């Protein structure tokens, strides 16, 4: 007899590409990819995941906490992973702010980029020695404090000129010192209050537009206040007010001072943020439901199976499948053969 070596012949619906034979049918393949499905976001496996800056500060937004709004200070957990759930963060209380006149909205999103976040315990500027005649510290019903008395943002001080100081001033300069610990970044919150012509006179003894200038790390910022005719109160406590505040932040790297040149209406920085380390940040939504190997901006919570995946590429953190352009398959069989005649 004649004994020969031969290869099988079966159904060959799968196709893979080769270097020297082009596309060939094969009897079997191992899929290397899947197209993931959209899910709720979740906690990253093996890593505490930050959502709200202050989880236990109820009825407080991230921006509220960042500005040091009364009732909104609590334990701020460190996290190596943070979810950016507000592309344009909003306030929900305290004195009415004209947010879009500065970069202030992004402040809490700046903070969540750090692993560790804490508010300073001492003030960065002493209101009783601050330039521009003698001051008293003003408060508002819009900002009720921890003992339910009238207060203000703990990050700032609404200084009012004393009765013997109701007068216009030349722009004075205060130096903002670096008071944070080894390695920490200091984020200084400040701003200025403005009002209609009448209230300006009562509060400051000047109803002309006031000018404010900040300088830190080679960045200079200039503002000129507005006298009356403000846009309506929004994202605030809800108590009707004739005036508006403008709020800004100022980043001070380790051992770096900043300066604020100001006139009337100044909100001097008090408590400042001290932040260190880096937190990995991706876009997402709240609440975080369950646990996952990988957080994906398009698919949310996602567990890893196949080594690769197809579909919408986006930012992703954790134990993730690697994005590929096409559904790759590993050959697990033989190139198609017609039945032997």
């Amino acid at each position: 007899d004649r004994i020969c070596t031969g290869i099988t012949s079966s159904n060959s619906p799968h196709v893979v590409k080769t270097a020297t034979q082009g596309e060939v049918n094969v009897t079997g393949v191992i899929p290397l990819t899947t197209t993931p499905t959209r899910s709720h976001f979740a906690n990253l496996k093996g890593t505490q995941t930050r959502g709200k800056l202050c989880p236990n500060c109820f009825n407080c937004t991230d921006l509220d906490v960042a500005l040091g709004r009364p009732k909104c200070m609590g334990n701020i957990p460190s996290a190596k992973v943070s979810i950016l759930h507000e592309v344009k963060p909003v306030t929900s209380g305290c004195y009415p702010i004209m947010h879009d006149r500065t970069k202030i909205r992004q402040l809490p999103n700046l903070l969540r980029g750090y692993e560790n976040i804490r508010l300073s315990t001492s003030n960065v500027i002493n209101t009783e020695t601050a330039p521009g005649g003698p001051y008293k510290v003003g408060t508002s019903g819009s900002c009720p404090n921890v003992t339910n008395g009238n207060g203000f943002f703990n990050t700032m001080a609404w200084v009012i000129p004393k009765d013997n100081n109701k007068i216009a001033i030349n722009p004075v300069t205060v130096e903002v010192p670096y008071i944070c610990s080894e390695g920490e970044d200091q984020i200084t919150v400040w701003g200025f209050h403005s009002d209609d012509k009448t209230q300006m006179e009562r509060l400051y003894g000047d109803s002309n537009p006031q000018k404010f200038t900040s300088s830190a790390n080679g960045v200079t910022t200039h503002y000129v206040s507005q006298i009356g005719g403000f846009p309506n109160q929004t994202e605030d406590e809800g108590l009707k007010q004739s005036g508006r505040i403008v709020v800004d932040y100022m980043v001070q790297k380790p051992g770096k001072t900043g300066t604020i040149v100001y006139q009337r209406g100044i909100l001097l920085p008090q408590k400042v943020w001290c932040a260190s380390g880096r937190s990995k940040v991706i876009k997402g939504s709240l609440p975080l439901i369950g646990e996952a190997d990988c957080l994906h901006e398009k698919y949310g919570g996602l567990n890893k199976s196949k080594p690769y995946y197809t579909g919408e590429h986006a930012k992703a953190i954790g134990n993730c499948p690697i994005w590929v352009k096409t559904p790759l398959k590993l050959a697990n069989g033989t190139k198609y053969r017609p039945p032997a005649k």
Binding site: D1, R2, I3, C4, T5, G6, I7, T8, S9, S10, V16, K17, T18, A19, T20, Q21, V24, V26, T27, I30, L32, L84, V87, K88, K103, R105, Q106, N109, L110, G113, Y114, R278, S279, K280, V281, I282, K283, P307, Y308, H313, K315, A316, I317, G318, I322, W323, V324, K325, T326, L328, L330, A331, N332, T334, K335, Y336, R337, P338, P339, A340
Partner: protein
């Protein structure tokens, strides 16, 4: 493959070969017998499995947001960041595509090499009395029906079972 085509190996295939990818056929008075070689099939499967594990070992850095670059304020920077992400995805995808291409190339191209190895398994069992043709076939003095072929695939076939000489 290209070897078999030039060597005059059979380009067709055997539907009766169901328990394996590669194996043997027998042509005699019985007609055409077909048996699969599990050893050849297992080796092929093991190579692919090792290849799968190798491809699955690749790790690349996560792409997340910049911690410093803020929306609205740093949009121009963020666009470049978007570009960096896109190009990373592009470059790594093509690298993996290349890696998979080379793996499949190896797998498909190794088919004839399994046959060539199967020749050596067959040749030894058939003994010195068999005649190697060269096209992947051997001519035997004895009959080799389906029962005989199974002993070959299982590596238990002896030439002494037909009083023919063996390689000791």
């Amino acid at each position: 493959g290209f070897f078999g085509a030039i060597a005059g190996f059979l380009e067709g295939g055997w539907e009766g070969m169901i328990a394996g990818w590669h194996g043997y056929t027998s042509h005699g008075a019985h007609g055409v017998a077909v048996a699969a070689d599990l050893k050849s099939t297992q080796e092929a499967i093991n190579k692919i499995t090792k290849n799968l594990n190798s491809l699955s070992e690749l790790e690349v850095k996560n792409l997340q947001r910049l911690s410093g670059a803020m929306n609205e304020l740093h949009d121009e920077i963020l666009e470049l960041d978007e570009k960096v992400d896109d190009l990373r995805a592009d470059t790594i995808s093509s690298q993996i595509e290349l890696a998979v291409l080379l793996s499949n190339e190896g797998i498909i191209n190794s088919e004839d090499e399994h046959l060539l190895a199967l020749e050596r398994k067959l040749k030894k069992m058939l003994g010195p009395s068999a005649v190697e043709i060269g096209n992947g076939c051997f001519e035997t003095k004895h009959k080799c029906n389906q029962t005989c072929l199974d002993r070959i695939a299982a590596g238990t076939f002896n030439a002494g079972d037909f009083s023919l000489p063996t390689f000791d």
